[PDB]
């Protein structure tokens, strides 16, 4: 039932290497060709990838800014409320962004904010404007 382990002998394969005096030579040059293609196509992408790596050279170290390490707070200052309305205008529902921008608020506090102030900061309206843009 079983060929020796690691010998490969498909029905389909056999009919191919036999059905002409040189069909072996066909099949084996054709794979040899395709092998060269694929080894060239590797050469292309190596050269491309190496050029792209030259463009990244330096990383992004010159551009990173230190981060706002800041404890949350029960109290909304007027500053904080005004930041928030503006973040809403820029970021729609993305609450995590909004908490980054404000920097003394958790994502929960933010979410409650949408609810408390909904009426007074016409938050509906604000969102309608962010939607109408994106």
């Amino acid at each position: 039932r079983k060929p020796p382990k690691g010998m490969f002998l498909s029905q389909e394969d056999v009919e191919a290497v036999s059905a002409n005096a040189t069909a072996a030579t066909t099949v084996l040059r054709q794979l040899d060709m395709e092998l060269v293609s694929v080894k060239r196509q590797i050469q292309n992408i190596k050269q491309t990838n190496s050029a792209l790596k030259e463009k990244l050279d330096g990383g992004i170290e010159p551009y990173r800014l230190p981060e706002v390490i800041q404890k949350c707070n029960a109290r909304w200052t007027t500053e904080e409320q005004l930041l928030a309305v503006q973040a809403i205008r820029k970021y729609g529902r993305d609450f995590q962004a909004i908490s980054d921008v404000i920097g003394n608020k958790s994502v929960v506090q933010v979410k409650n904010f949408f609810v408390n102030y909904r009426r007074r900061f016409n938050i509906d309206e604000v969102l309608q404007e962010w939607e109408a843009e994106h």
């Binding site: 060929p3 010998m7 029905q11 072996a24 990838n49 500053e79 930041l83």
Partner: protein
Amino acid sequence: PSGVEGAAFQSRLPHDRMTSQEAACFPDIISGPQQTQKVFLFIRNRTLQLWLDNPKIQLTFEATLQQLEAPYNSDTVLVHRVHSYLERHGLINFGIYKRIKPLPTKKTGKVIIIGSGVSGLAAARQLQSFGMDVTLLEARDRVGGRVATFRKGNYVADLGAMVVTGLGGNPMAVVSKQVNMELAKIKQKCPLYEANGQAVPKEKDEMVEQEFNRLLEATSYLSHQLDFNVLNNKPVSLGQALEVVIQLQEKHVKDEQIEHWKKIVKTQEELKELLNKMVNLKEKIKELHQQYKEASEVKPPRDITAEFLVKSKHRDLTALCKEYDELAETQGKLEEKLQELEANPPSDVYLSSRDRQILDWHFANLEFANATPLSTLSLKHWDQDDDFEFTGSHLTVRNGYSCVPVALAEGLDIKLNTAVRQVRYTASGCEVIAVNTRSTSQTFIYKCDAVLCTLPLGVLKQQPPAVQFVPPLPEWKTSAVQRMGFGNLNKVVLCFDRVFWDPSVNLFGHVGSTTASRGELFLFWNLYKAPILLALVAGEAAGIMENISDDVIVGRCLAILKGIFGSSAVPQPKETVVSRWRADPWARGSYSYVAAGSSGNDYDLMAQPITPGPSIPGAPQPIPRLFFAGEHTIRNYPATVHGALLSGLREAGRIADQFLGAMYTLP
């Protein structure tokens, strides 16, 4: 096995079942009740045992009955029928025994046996054993045929058969008990040595041996599981099948390499897509950083849209900086997958050149044993007789294998230098016409009831015919002769001044530069404790080599050897001989093989006797006249000395049944 059960095995019989021959001689028993079957078997195995325990003297029916113990002792007709079957058919009182019962003074029937080989000799000696009158005609000036020993001073070397292929079940065991053969076990360690003379190293020797083995298993798979036995209109050779198998290993090596290099591109394409994302992202970062720098120019305290703007850009830039750090983690991974894959390729090629040459030697070794190019062997059937192997180790005949035919010829009417030319068989009997080999117009005529033909299959195949049959052999027989193969295999005997090689080792190989010359002096044998080396020419080499001078051949021999043991260590040889079996016109090759196109069924066809039509029209069916023996007529034991011997035994039984009658087959 052993006991009585061993005697069966040692006679190539199943200790616990009745054979076809037994059935046909003992229908009453085998269609009988099973208990009588056990009795039969016992008596058989027991008589076999008595003969085997002592085959230097005739085992008579009385001696047999004497030594059976009742209830088996009781039925004396059975014991008689059984003893007679065995005797007739050559299972007991074969070979060279002291006769107890004396020979019928008056003889019955006359047989002419063509050829004094082992088959011939063995039949002769049985028929005379039985009271027929027998004469052998032999073309050569000596008896043993293709058992052909070289002898000069104390040098002794077989050019013919050389090896006893193991004693377990081999009638030659009986023969060595009877003759003095000095048998000698052969050390199976075989060292190889590439074209230059460097020992192959144990690493490669084994890689390649295993691969040889896998490649054969593979043909077998190809044959049985895939039915790959006809291709176009023709039958497939073992050689073709091996090509195909190797071509597909070459293909799968490429296929592997392809899928690996495809893993590399697909990985490179991902790295590219990612390095693109990363280059765009550094751009948006750069821009945002400037923007932040700018918005930060507005100094505090400032209105809240300005504050928003600083804080918002800051956020955005750290969000993208984070995103880029993720992407450059991924990048370091993707670059690892790639140092991994570039370091772990699949194998480069299926076989190196040193590998494919070393494998060629394994193929030469096989061409050697089948005495023919692998391209001629039947894929389905080349190995059809391998089930019939004996047991124990291959041996050689220290005093020369000739000692056997020579022994067998004692007492026997042999005409040497008598080449048969025509064989005439008719309803009334036969006439054989021969000539003197020396003076080839001196002409002889032998009249007989029956001819046994043991002419070699080579000789039967010769165009135009060395021997004419009158009437001609029927198509059924001639087509079998055409389809069977008759190969070739040669030896070079190097007789030396002093032993210069590892005597711990009987044999060693030489690897051939090309595939085309894989057979050419591919192997060397040293005769046990004696200063002689033989070198073998096999496959396609054998034929070609025949047509090249002896000094050249001994040339190439000395060279190869100098390359291994160094130019200082290798003398000129005292004597040399070179076999040429295909040119030998009494042989026309070495031995038969199952050519592609044939089966073992052809060996049986080869053994069937011929029965001439009636002389007067509408007179009844004669009896058969022309019988056949020799190596090419025994399906289970072709191309050996034991099988030649068995074929003769067989025919002698067939002829005696036919001309003396077989009393023992009657209830």
